[model samples]
Target: SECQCGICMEILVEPVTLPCNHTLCKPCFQSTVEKASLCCPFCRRRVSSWTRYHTRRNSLVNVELWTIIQKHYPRECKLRASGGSALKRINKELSDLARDPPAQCSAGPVGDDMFHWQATIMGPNDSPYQGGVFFLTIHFPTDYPFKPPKVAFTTRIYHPNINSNGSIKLDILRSQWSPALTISKVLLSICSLLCDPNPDDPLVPEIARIYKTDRDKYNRISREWTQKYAMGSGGSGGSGSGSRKESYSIYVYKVLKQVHPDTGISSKAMGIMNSFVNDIFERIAGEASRLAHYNKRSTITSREIQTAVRLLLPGELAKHAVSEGTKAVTKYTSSAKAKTRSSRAGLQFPVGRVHRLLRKGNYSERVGAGAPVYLAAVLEYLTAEILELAGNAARDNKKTRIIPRHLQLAIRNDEELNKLLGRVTIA
Candidate 1:
């Protein structure tokens, strides 16, 4: 009557059903196999000779039993993970930022949108924007702490990094972002952005030119912008409140809510949608690029895209997406005056580099002139997917950079990804 594992006398973590009609915890079985050499501890049967299922890496777990245990004893399984969860970390940050907010920076929730926050960054001394205050709009996506919050200046002040449309291009906001960055930390970074204008990589080249050739004029223009924008501000309050091939998660959710207004979204659900959309795009484009090269075509057009979509996808969905894509492409062609487009649009890496790899490998004696075009496309596609996966995985552990653990975690988690990159062990 006891549900306890006979060997360990404890509740199972991952239970496996032995060939001899016996069920035991996985770890306990692992110990038995390692120490006792394939001997079943209870019945003393040699399970190795019976079935080849356990020889491969994935098997030995009773999937049915493991799921049942997970349903009933979720926390037992979760004993290995989670205490400093994302939400808890946010709670701590709110209180800490409350107690000791950063210098001349104030941040808090905006109205009913707790995920949306307002931040005020007072101009740094000695900078052109010295006397002015800049307001920033902060957007915390469903995945906070893991994913970096999107912060952009609402109050316009001329800086090399910040654009007129209130967009910011900073390393911390993009590639260099880590979970360790709090709102205060970012504002501090923004403080330095104003003081040390990144003239080399300026958002406004004209401002960058002015900074280089006429430093006096650059300062004057910046000060004028600040004086007009910042001096005319109202009382500071918390309540005051992307496009390049982006994930359709936000739009998908919008339509979802259109059908059922009361519907809600979880962080996990959004990520799943992102992965799903990204996977399809990757697969289809990957196929199209491959197809173009096979036909020795230097340029890829709507034809290749349509054909690839038809080839890669199943039933109704494939045809619908193809029809939509074809319509969009045909409509663009009707209005556009551009000539034939090629590798630059389809893939990032140049074909010459891929051609060298092919030459070294000697895969084909008379390779298609366009073979490297699609080959490079496939390589770029795979690299981007790997990078994105690693990034999310690093975020999962609340880290800034992708470690080997994060890379492995990324590959091992998903079924489709694991198939291709599963055997790989990171250095």
Candidate 2:
């Protein structure tokens, strides 16, 4: 709905006035005064200026004109992109989106303006996003299908890929939308986005690392967000999503005792020792995030945290600061980054059972929905993570599949997985 008025000296600005205000009408005033009044007041100017002038951030734009456009005709402002063929392409997809909608998704023009439409996707049952009815708005560029739909969430989903602004880190939406990328394609893409978020590429990367470190905790927070923002109905509010936080102090304690061996923190005395590490790590992480967000940077590196710890613990206490130069990270952070390295093609896993477990035996003949391929792909990577560990033991002793004994062995030996599933008694 927010169209930038980046018209040149050649293009017309007359059509801009219909939906936009008087200020928008004059934003294209070429050469009057580059720094003249907010809107340039005639001729051609950058639509980026028109857009940015309306709001602080580029993602933030004039919804006032959007409301106007949402209410009435868009033909008043001629389509600027391509031939009428583009319009026909949009229209064709419009009907398809209606006639055969994406599963748990519905969308159509809010009013008569095809340029602006409102859509909603039912949160997939498998994901933490379930029970949340998410609303999204779509803006069709003058050249659509060719240009992927500019879709953003109206619903506030506490997700890594889904940003605070509801913008997504989806490849199809931003990378380069192929000409025939249908609305159905995108909506279904969103459906699966809920089912299995690609945590590798995150919009709100803070949440991404959280998802990586403690997935269930991340999931519980997502469920919390959905209950608050998405499902605000009844007493589904009382019992929060998976109210359990396991402090993995026992192992950390065991490791410490092994290294030092002579001393002990009296494990039974109290887990106050737990709070020390948590507070040190917690506040340090907070300051690091603050350092990054304050700098308006998206990616937060060790430089942020490395500098951050010094800030929190001030004076000589922070003396061992390593800011002699602007040196970056070494291999310390490489430990956790291993989560991203997954070889899906190597060890194939069962997908048929995955579907049989979730999607019941109803429609066997009809085949559609690209999301399952992703689910199985994600599922395979997941199974392989634990399975390979189990396999390691089995290969040495007995060449075997996932047995409970091996599974327990896998969990016990693996440090991170143990933290996640150590106490998870899978009988």
Candidate 3:
């Protein structure tokens, strides 16, 4: 009896009949309308403007005859095959529902120990009821999807279509019921209602009551509901909610996994990692401050020049450079071995390299601590400098293009090195 109306398991409103003698509700006929061929809803017989059965004397008797047409005809059968626009619309609606998922809640199970479905919907932005979360429910029929789900809200929401009990005021659910309609589409329609409440057909007396009285309060309550429930405690953060410290810790851990080439250190390695990390931040910040000072100065002051130099060079190496520079001034005034000593300035830059490779030629004296040990330290310092520079550059969004010029300038800022060679770049 239900199938005769082409309404699946539900009752249809404002039923109509075609000349081919098939019947359906207004919405079902609208969904299936085609310009090329208008067919009977039950038998799929082609009809034209010639098939106007409703104008005759007995429209109800005509509907009864058309109902028999549906009963005799096969289920879900049309002139078209399985693949068509109707099928596509159904599939798209199903996918959308799955991704956004229907909200569900339970106040308590009603009748026969079944869980009572309830949900709170947050009002969307720019609506009178914005910031409000409206509570609602779904009563699943014995057979669902094949039949429509009964949805209602528990919270008092002020909307045009939704009643005080939270029943949706949409035509699709009631008079417009279709076999193709899924629970997903129904839920989304409810979500849309939060943004645009229809005052033309309202459920709540208070909301409809205030639709005339205080519009601002209605909007404020809607927003409050949305923030408190639907969006989840003011929203923000990814997936599950967390504290600021928790989020920051997660970010740090992710970055720590990357290895630093010089020390071959990663967050995976053990012992005093936090201290080493702090030292790196300090070096980068110090370098930036020194460069800022230098760029601003017309003639760099001794303090500014020294600051720039110190930034480029390690503390110990910079100290050595300052000492050598002082000695050079002193030696030249005193008519001492300035050339020989100045030539040896390169030796100070790669103290470890010069000590290991040039130890036999320059000083035949028995070496203490051996050249290999200090050579390794210089290598370590150089590696650290390179790693720090690379890390900072990677993190900075502004420094999109880095070239030899930038690298050389960075190295020159170090007071330790004697002078830059035309081709010599850092290893």
Candidate 4:
């Protein structure tokens, strides 16, 4: 019987021996020869030829042939020994293919512009969009993975980052694009854009402009778009229904000011009022977003409305309507004399009786009720009350200062309360 191969140790079946006279089984030799070369395993001498056509022999003993041969030879083998190398090569090729897949180059047979692609994206919550199923299209390059793909939006959305033409303004897609980015990863970035719009580099100027000038309008539009387009109902409501509740709030404020009894507003008070009116929209818009998230139906509840008011309005304004000190009262009295100029003669810092009524929670009990229509009415009353207090505080001049910024500070501090005001501001 011939010796067994060092690897699969079996008695030489059709014995094939190397030039080094290291005889082994033919089957085991064939496996190693096809993978690399028939290098000598014994004396390190090059093996030139081997006899292929041979007859079978008895099986070799099941012993540790590899360890035993290495101990005696004290030499090394150069090439692979068996066909197992072929199996390893095949496995490596499969692994490489899985890591980077080829693009689906063929375009869909639908519309010329409509391309179909499957993409995976991360979920973004807590904005105009939350729990949304977003789809994206990828236009493959003639030489893919080498050239960047063209990406555009197929779904209609209202965002500062994506233009009406469905082009998204993202740095990675623009100047910072790298060929290393995969289609799946890029899709995930788009999903993130929905939750956070980049106003610095805007694709939709109209949306960005509104977001900058009027936050409430921006929030309304975003909510409206999410409902109309994101919900798969391509129906945009008529202009009449889509008009923001903002106009209504403003109209109510005007009417309430006309009935305001505190006629002693100062220049500082005027500045504060302007600021408050300017920022009110954003506050309301935030509330609108919150309401839409919890309640998809187009109806806002009375509780939400009241909570918004309590949040946005300053606590001081909410509680007190007049300047609260003797020093302030005296300052109002001295202002007319101190100026030495002809002006309307009145109480040192004249204030309306309406403030006392509101302070007592008696101006209009109708405001606190569940009547939805009375929401506008309540807002009007609150505005009047706040303005009255600010005017009185300013006149007192004992630094009983009431200003619009105070209202803003109060709103900004109110984590839960201010969000109820709807979308009036962005950040």
Off by over 4 Å in 1: 1-85, 237-427
- Which candidate would rank higher by TM-score, 1 or 3? 1
State which candidate has the highest lDDT: 1
Error of 3 at 364 (Å): 84
TM-score of each: 0.37, 0.36, 0.30, 0.29
In terms of lDDT, model 4 sits at 0.42
The best-first sequence of candidates by TM-score reads 1, 2, 3, 4
Per-residue alpha-carbon lDDT of candidate 4 for residues 1-427, written as tens digits (9 for 90 to 100): 2343443432333445555556555555565452455454334355533322221222322235544443544333211232243233223322433355322111110111112222322125556654333333455555343345677654467789987666878876756564335444565566667667788778777788888899888877777776665563211111111112222333323533464433333344445454444344334323532443345333333445445555555565333312222223334345655542111112222122212211121111112212122233344444554445444444545434445544444345555325533244422
Which structure is stronger by lDDT: 2 or 4?
Answer: 2
Residue-wise lDDT of candidate 2 within 1-427, one digit each (tens)? 3343322211233223421342332333322223443332332233446544543553332355545643464563444322154576667666656566777776765323556565667778888888987766677888554466799886789887988777887888876565435777888988888887777878888888998899989989989988887764211111111113324354334433443343233342114323333334334444543554356443334456457545554443344323211111222123354332212212132323323322221111111222122233333333334545655655556553334566567768877556544555544
For model 1, how does the per-residue alpha-carbon lDDT over 137-178 read when each residue is reduced to its tens digit?
A: 677867565467898876778877788877887887877765
| Ranked candidates (lDDT, high to low) | 1, 2, 4, 3
* Per-residue lDDT of 163 in model 3: 60
Q: How close is candidate 4 to the true structure, as a TM-score?
A: 0.29
1 against 4, candidate with superior TM-score? 1
lDDT of 3 by residue, 1-427 (tens): 5443443322343356566645565555655533333665444567645434442433433455445544555344241123143333333433444355555311211211122232344454546445554544455555333345577754555465666445677776766655555555566676676666666676666676676677787766655654544332221111111111111223223333333322222332212222332233233323432343235321212233245435555567666534543443343335544444323332222333333322221111112322222222332344344334434443443453333333444445545322312134333
- State the C-alpha lDDT per candidate: 0.59, 0.50, 0.41, 0.42
lDDT of 2: 0.50
